[PDB]
Amino acid sequence: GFKQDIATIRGDLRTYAQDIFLAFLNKYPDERRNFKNYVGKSDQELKSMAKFGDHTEKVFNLMMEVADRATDCVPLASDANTLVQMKQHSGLTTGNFEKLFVALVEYMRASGQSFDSQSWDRFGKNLVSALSSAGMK
Ligand code: HEM
Ligand SMILES: Oc1c(Cl)cc(Cl)cc1Cl
Ligand SMILES: Oc1c(Cl)cc(Cl)cc1Cl
């Protein structure tokens, strides 16, 4: 289920984070244009840039912290606050997050594995709603 999925992801976090972020960028090419250093790069080119590995790992670590702290796929209000607050996220609407989760759920459904895709969909929906409550437009 959802808690096991967190362990599955954590066990090979950089690999999952990279493949899921690539799925996002590839499904939603306009979102790539917000990452200047990743424009004009193939999947294998990104996987060799240090900030790409590092940044994906740090994003997914935080995502997994938020997932682990959630109750029944509902994140903590305080976690939503952090995500709205972060300087890094001053550009963003909740649409950006919705898209990430669509890509994540699709990746999970396509993978060989017994991810609880439905729970990740609900978690994403609940995170988006918590981001609105914490003030993201
Ligand atoms: C639950 C979802 C997400 C989490 C946990 C998360 C977390 C983070 C973290 C920890 C960083 C800092 C990375 C670093 O400095 O090494 C970051 C940076 C960033 N995030 Fe997110 N993020 C999420 C969703 C999104 C989405 C959907 C977008 C855009 C579509 C986005 C855009 C960015 C951008 C542009 C930065 C730039 C940091 C910089 O280099 O200045 N994030 N995010
Ligand atoms: O920074 C991101 C990562 Cl590492 C993965 C996904 Cl799915 C989306 C974003 Cl916006
Ligand atoms: O370099 C980044 C990566 Cl690969 C993922 C995200 Cl979400 C943000 C940044 Cl700044």
Side-chain angles (χ1 to χ4, degrees), residues 56-98:
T56 62
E57 177 158 288
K58 289 188 168 73
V59 168
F60 275 69
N61 175 55
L62 178 62
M63 192 192 291
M64 294 304 100
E65 292 196 335
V66 177
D68 204 38
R69 285 190 292 265
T71 296
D72 287 356
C73 304
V74 180
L76 296 174
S78 54
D79 284 333
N81 200 31
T82 302
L83 291 166
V84 172
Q85 269 187 343
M86 277 161 63
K87 341 293 187 190
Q88 301 84 314
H89 293 170
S90 51
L92 307 178
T93 71
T94 61
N96 299 120
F97 289 79
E98 286 158 51

Short mmCIF file of all heavy atoms in Angstrom, two decimals, residues 56-98:
data_model
loop_
_atom_site.label_atom_id
_atom_site.label_comp_id
_atom_site.label_asym_id
_atom_site.label_seq_id
_atom_site.Cartn_x
_atom_site.Cartn_y
_atom_site.Cartn_z
N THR A 56 16.60 16.28 -8.02
CA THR A 56 15.52 15.29 -8.00
C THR A 56 15.48 14.49 -6.70
O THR A 56 14.40 14.31 -6.12
CB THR A 56 15.47 14.37 -9.20
OG1 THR A 56 16.68 13.59 -9.27
CG2 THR A 56 15.27 15.12 -10.47
N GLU A 57 16.65 14.07 -6.23
CA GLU A 57 16.75 13.42 -4.99
C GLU A 57 16.17 14.30 -3.82
O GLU A 57 15.41 13.82 -2.98
CB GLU A 57 18.20 13.02 -4.71
CG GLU A 57 18.42 12.37 -3.36
CD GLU A 57 19.68 11.53 -3.30
OE1 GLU A 57 19.61 10.48 -3.94
OE2 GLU A 57 20.71 11.92 -2.64
N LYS A 58 16.53 15.57 -3.76
CA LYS A 58 16.08 16.41 -2.65
C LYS A 58 14.58 16.69 -2.70
O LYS A 58 13.91 16.74 -1.65
CB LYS A 58 16.89 17.68 -2.65
CG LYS A 58 18.33 17.40 -2.18
CD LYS A 58 19.10 18.69 -1.97
CE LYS A 58 20.41 18.49 -1.25
NZ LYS A 58 21.43 17.84 -2.10
N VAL A 59 14.04 16.85 -3.93
CA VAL A 59 12.58 17.00 -4.08
C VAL A 59 11.82 15.76 -3.60
O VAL A 59 10.85 15.87 -2.82
CB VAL A 59 12.23 17.34 -5.55
CG1 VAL A 59 10.72 17.22 -5.83
CG2 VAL A 59 12.76 18.73 -5.84
N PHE A 60 12.28 14.59 -4.05
CA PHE A 60 11.59 13.36 -3.71
C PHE A 60 11.83 12.98 -2.27
O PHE A 60 10.94 12.43 -1.64
CB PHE A 60 11.90 12.23 -4.67
CG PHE A 60 11.01 12.26 -5.87
CD1 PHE A 60 11.16 13.28 -6.79
CD2 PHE A 60 9.97 11.38 -6.02
CE1 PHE A 60 10.32 13.37 -7.88
CE2 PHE A 60 9.12 11.47 -7.10
CZ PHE A 60 9.27 12.48 -8.01
N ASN A 61 12.98 13.32 -1.69
CA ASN A 61 13.10 13.13 -0.24
C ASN A 61 12.02 13.88 0.50
O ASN A 61 11.40 13.35 1.39
CB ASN A 61 14.48 13.62 0.22
CG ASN A 61 14.65 13.57 1.68
OD1 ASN A 61 14.47 12.54 2.28
ND2 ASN A 61 15.00 14.68 2.27
N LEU A 62 11.82 15.14 0.15
CA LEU A 62 10.82 15.94 0.83
C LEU A 62 9.43 15.41 0.55
O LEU A 62 8.60 15.30 1.49
CB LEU A 62 10.93 17.42 0.50
CG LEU A 62 9.86 18.28 1.16
CD1 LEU A 62 9.96 18.21 2.72
CD2 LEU A 62 9.98 19.75 0.69
N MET A 63 9.16 15.04 -0.70
CA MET A 63 7.88 14.43 -0.99
C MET A 63 7.62 13.20 -0.10
O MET A 63 6.51 13.03 0.43
CB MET A 63 7.77 14.03 -2.47
CG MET A 63 6.36 13.67 -2.83
SD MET A 63 6.27 12.87 -4.43
CE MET A 63 6.67 14.22 -5.52
N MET A 64 8.63 12.33 0.08
CA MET A 64 8.45 11.17 0.88
C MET A 64 8.28 11.49 2.38
O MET A 64 7.54 10.80 3.07
CB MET A 64 9.60 10.17 0.67
CG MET A 64 9.69 9.55 -0.73
SD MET A 64 8.19 8.70 -1.27
CE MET A 64 7.45 9.95 -2.32
N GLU A 65 8.94 12.55 2.87
CA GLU A 65 8.75 13.02 4.22
C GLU A 65 7.30 13.46 4.41
O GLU A 65 6.67 13.07 5.38
CB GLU A 65 9.75 14.13 4.60
CG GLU A 65 11.15 13.51 4.68
CD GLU A 65 12.31 14.22 5.36
OE1 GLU A 65 12.30 15.44 5.45
OE2 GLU A 65 13.30 13.50 5.77
N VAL A 66 6.77 14.24 3.46
CA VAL A 66 5.38 14.67 3.51
C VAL A 66 4.43 13.47 3.44
O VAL A 66 3.45 13.36 4.23
CB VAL A 66 5.11 15.71 2.41
CG1 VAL A 66 3.65 16.14 2.40
CG2 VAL A 66 5.99 16.96 2.62
N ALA A 67 4.69 12.55 2.55
CA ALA A 67 3.89 11.32 2.45
C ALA A 67 3.93 10.53 3.74
O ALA A 67 2.90 10.02 4.17
CB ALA A 67 4.33 10.47 1.28
N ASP A 68 5.11 10.42 4.36
CA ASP A 68 5.20 9.60 5.56
C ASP A 68 4.45 10.25 6.73
O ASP A 68 3.92 9.53 7.58
CB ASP A 68 6.63 9.34 5.95
CG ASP A 68 6.76 8.07 6.80
OD1 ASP A 68 6.06 7.02 6.57
OD2 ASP A 68 7.57 8.14 7.74
N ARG A 69 4.48 11.58 6.80
CA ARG A 69 3.83 12.33 7.89
C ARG A 69 2.31 12.43 7.70
O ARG A 69 1.59 12.79 8.67
CB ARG A 69 4.44 13.74 8.06
CG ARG A 69 5.80 13.74 8.75
CD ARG A 69 6.22 15.16 9.11
NE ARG A 69 6.52 16.03 7.96
CZ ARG A 69 7.74 16.23 7.47
NH1 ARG A 69 8.76 15.55 7.97
NH2 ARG A 69 7.94 17.05 6.46
N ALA A 70 1.81 12.10 6.49
CA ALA A 70 0.36 12.18 6.21
C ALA A 70 -0.42 11.13 7.00
O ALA A 70 0.13 10.13 7.45
CB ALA A 70 0.09 11.97 4.71
N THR A 71 -1.72 11.40 7.20
CA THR A 71 -2.61 10.40 7.78
C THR A 71 -3.63 10.08 6.70
O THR A 71 -4.24 11.00 6.15
CB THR A 71 -3.29 10.95 9.02
OG1 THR A 71 -2.27 11.21 10.02
CG2 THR A 71 -4.39 10.01 9.57
N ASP A 72 -3.79 8.80 6.37
CA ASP A 72 -4.73 8.37 5.32
C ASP A 72 -4.60 9.25 4.02
O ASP A 72 -5.60 9.73 3.46
CB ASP A 72 -6.15 8.36 5.81
CG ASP A 72 -6.46 7.22 6.77
OD1 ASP A 72 -5.59 6.36 7.02
OD2 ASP A 72 -7.59 7.15 7.30
N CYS A 73 -3.36 9.47 3.60
CA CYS A 73 -3.06 10.24 2.38
C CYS A 73 -3.46 11.72 2.45
O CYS A 73 -3.55 12.38 1.42
CB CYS A 73 -3.64 9.57 1.12
SG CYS A 73 -3.07 7.86 0.96
N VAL A 74 -3.65 12.25 3.67
CA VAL A 74 -3.90 13.68 3.89
C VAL A 74 -2.66 14.28 4.52
O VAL A 74 -2.30 13.92 5.62
CB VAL A 74 -5.14 13.92 4.79
CG1 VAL A 74 -5.36 15.42 4.98
CG2 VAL A 74 -6.36 13.29 4.14
N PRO A 75 -1.98 15.17 3.80
CA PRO A 75 -0.77 15.76 4.38
C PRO A 75 -1.10 16.74 5.48
O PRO A 75 -2.20 17.35 5.52
CB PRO A 75 -0.14 16.50 3.21
CG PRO A 75 -1.29 16.89 2.38
CD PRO A 75 -2.32 15.80 2.52
N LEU A 76 -0.10 16.94 6.33
CA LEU A 76 -0.14 17.95 7.36
C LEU A 76 -0.25 19.35 6.75
O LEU A 76 0.41 19.70 5.77
CB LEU A 76 1.10 17.89 8.26
CG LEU A 76 1.31 16.64 9.08
CD1 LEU A 76 2.65 16.73 9.78
CD2 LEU A 76 0.19 16.42 10.11
N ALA A 77 -1.10 20.15 7.34
CA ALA A 77 -1.21 21.56 6.98
C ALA A 77 0.16 22.26 7.03
O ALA A 77 0.49 23.06 6.15
CB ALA A 77 -2.19 22.24 7.92
N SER A 78 0.95 21.96 8.04
CA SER A 78 2.27 22.56 8.17
C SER A 78 3.21 22.22 7.00
O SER A 78 4.01 23.03 6.58
CB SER A 78 2.91 22.17 9.51
OG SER A 78 2.94 20.79 9.67
N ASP A 79 3.09 21.00 6.47
CA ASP A 79 3.87 20.62 5.29
C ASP A 79 3.44 21.38 4.03
O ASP A 79 4.28 21.78 3.18
CB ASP A 79 3.83 19.08 5.06
CG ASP A 79 4.73 18.33 6.05
OD1 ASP A 79 5.74 18.94 6.52
OD2 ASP A 79 4.46 17.14 6.40
N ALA A 80 2.14 21.57 3.89
CA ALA A 80 1.66 22.32 2.78
C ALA A 80 2.22 23.74 2.90
O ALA A 80 2.68 24.35 1.90
CB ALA A 80 0.14 22.28 2.77
N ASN A 81 2.27 24.26 4.12
CA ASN A 81 2.79 25.62 4.32
C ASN A 81 4.22 25.76 3.79
O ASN A 81 4.53 26.65 2.99
CB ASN A 81 2.75 26.03 5.77
CG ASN A 81 2.81 27.55 5.96
OD1 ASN A 81 2.35 28.37 5.13
ND2 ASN A 81 3.32 27.92 7.11
N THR A 82 5.07 24.85 4.21
CA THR A 82 6.45 24.82 3.70
C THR A 82 6.54 24.86 2.15
O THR A 82 7.34 25.61 1.55
CB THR A 82 7.14 23.58 4.26
OG1 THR A 82 7.09 23.62 5.69
CG2 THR A 82 8.58 23.51 3.78
N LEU A 83 5.72 24.05 1.50
CA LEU A 83 5.78 23.98 0.04
C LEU A 83 5.30 25.25 -0.65
O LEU A 83 5.78 25.60 -1.73
CB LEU A 83 4.96 22.78 -0.45
CG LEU A 83 5.57 21.43 -0.10
CD1 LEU A 83 4.51 20.34 -0.31
CD2 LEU A 83 6.83 21.14 -0.91
N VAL A 84 4.33 25.93 -0.05
CA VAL A 84 3.88 27.21 -0.62
C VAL A 84 4.93 28.30 -0.40
O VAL A 84 5.14 29.16 -1.28
CB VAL A 84 2.52 27.64 0.01
CG1 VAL A 84 2.14 29.05 -0.42
CG2 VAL A 84 1.41 26.65 -0.37
N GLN A 85 5.59 28.21 0.76
CA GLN A 85 6.49 29.23 1.30
C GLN A 85 7.80 29.32 0.58
O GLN A 85 8.28 30.41 0.27
CB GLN A 85 6.82 28.94 2.78
CG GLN A 85 5.88 29.58 3.80
CD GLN A 85 6.39 29.37 5.22
OE1 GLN A 85 7.25 28.51 5.46
NE2 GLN A 85 5.89 30.17 6.17
N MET A 86 8.38 28.15 0.34
CA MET A 86 9.73 28.04 -0.19
C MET A 86 9.96 29.04 -1.31
O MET A 86 9.14 29.11 -2.23
CB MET A 86 9.93 26.65 -0.81
CG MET A 86 10.29 25.56 0.15
SD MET A 86 9.94 23.94 -0.59
CE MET A 86 11.08 24.02 -1.99
N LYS A 87 11.04 29.82 -1.23
CA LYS A 87 11.40 30.78 -2.31
C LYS A 87 11.32 30.08 -3.66
O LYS A 87 10.86 30.65 -4.65
CB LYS A 87 12.84 31.35 -2.21
CG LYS A 87 13.53 31.24 -0.86
CD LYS A 87 12.87 32.11 0.19
CE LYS A 87 13.69 32.12 1.46
NZ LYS A 87 12.93 32.77 2.56
N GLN A 88 11.84 28.86 -3.69
CA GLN A 88 11.93 28.08 -4.92
C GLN A 88 10.58 27.98 -5.63
O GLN A 88 10.51 27.92 -6.86
CB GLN A 88 12.49 26.67 -4.61
CG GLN A 88 13.88 26.66 -3.96
CD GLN A 88 13.95 26.84 -2.45
OE1 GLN A 88 13.30 27.72 -1.87
NE2 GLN A 88 14.79 26.02 -1.79
N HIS A 89 9.50 28.00 -4.83
CA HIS A 89 8.14 27.81 -5.33
C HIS A 89 7.33 29.07 -5.55
O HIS A 89 6.13 28.99 -5.81
CB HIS A 89 7.37 26.87 -4.37
CG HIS A 89 7.89 25.47 -4.35
ND1 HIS A 89 7.47 24.53 -3.42
CD2 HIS A 89 8.77 24.83 -5.15
CE1 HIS A 89 8.07 23.38 -3.66
NE2 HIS A 89 8.87 23.53 -4.71
N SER A 90 7.97 30.24 -5.48
CA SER A 90 7.24 31.51 -5.65
C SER A 90 6.59 31.67 -7.05
O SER A 90 5.58 32.37 -7.19
CB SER A 90 8.16 32.70 -5.35
OG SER A 90 9.36 32.59 -6.07
N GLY A 91 7.16 31.04 -8.07
CA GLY A 91 6.53 31.03 -9.38
C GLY A 91 5.19 30.29 -9.51
O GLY A 91 4.37 30.63 -10.37
N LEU A 92 4.94 29.31 -8.62
CA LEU A 92 4.03 28.17 -8.91
C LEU A 92 2.52 28.35 -8.61
O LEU A 92 2.14 29.05 -7.67
CB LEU A 92 4.55 26.91 -8.18
CG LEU A 92 6.01 26.53 -8.43
CD1 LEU A 92 6.38 25.29 -7.62
CD2 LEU A 92 6.30 26.30 -9.92
N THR A 93 1.67 27.74 -9.45
CA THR A 93 0.30 27.43 -9.09
C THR A 93 0.12 25.94 -8.71
O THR A 93 1.02 25.08 -8.86
CB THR A 93 -0.69 27.85 -10.20
OG1 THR A 93 -0.58 26.99 -11.35
CG2 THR A 93 -0.39 29.27 -10.60
N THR A 94 -1.07 25.64 -8.20
CA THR A 94 -1.38 24.27 -7.81
C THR A 94 -1.43 23.37 -9.06
O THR A 94 -1.25 22.18 -8.94
CB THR A 94 -2.69 24.15 -7.00
OG1 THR A 94 -3.80 24.60 -7.78
CG2 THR A 94 -2.61 24.95 -5.73
N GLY A 95 -1.68 23.97 -10.22
CA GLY A 95 -1.62 23.27 -11.48
C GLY A 95 -0.29 22.58 -11.72
O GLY A 95 -0.26 21.49 -12.27
N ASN A 96 0.80 23.22 -11.34
CA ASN A 96 2.12 22.64 -11.53
C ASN A 96 2.21 21.31 -10.77
O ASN A 96 2.79 20.33 -11.25
CB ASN A 96 3.21 23.57 -10.99
CG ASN A 96 3.25 24.92 -11.67
OD1 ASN A 96 3.08 25.94 -11.03
ND2 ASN A 96 3.50 24.93 -12.97
N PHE A 97 1.65 21.29 -9.57
CA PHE A 97 1.65 20.09 -8.71
C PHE A 97 0.72 18.99 -9.15
O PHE A 97 1.07 17.83 -9.08
CB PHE A 97 1.29 20.46 -7.28
CG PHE A 97 2.37 21.22 -6.60
CD1 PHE A 97 2.54 22.59 -6.86
CD2 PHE A 97 3.25 20.58 -5.73
CE1 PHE A 97 3.57 23.29 -6.26
CE2 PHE A 97 4.27 21.29 -5.14
CZ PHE A 97 4.42 22.64 -5.41
N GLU A 98 -0.48 19.39 -9.57
CA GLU A 98 -1.43 18.48 -10.18
C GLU A 98 -0.74 17.75 -11.31
O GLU A 98 -0.90 16.55 -11.43
CB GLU A 98 -2.62 19.23 -10.81
CG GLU A 98 -3.68 19.80 -9.88
CD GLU A 98 -4.48 20.94 -10.54
OE1 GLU A 98 -4.99 20.75 -11.67
OE2 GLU A 98 -4.58 22.04 -9.94
#
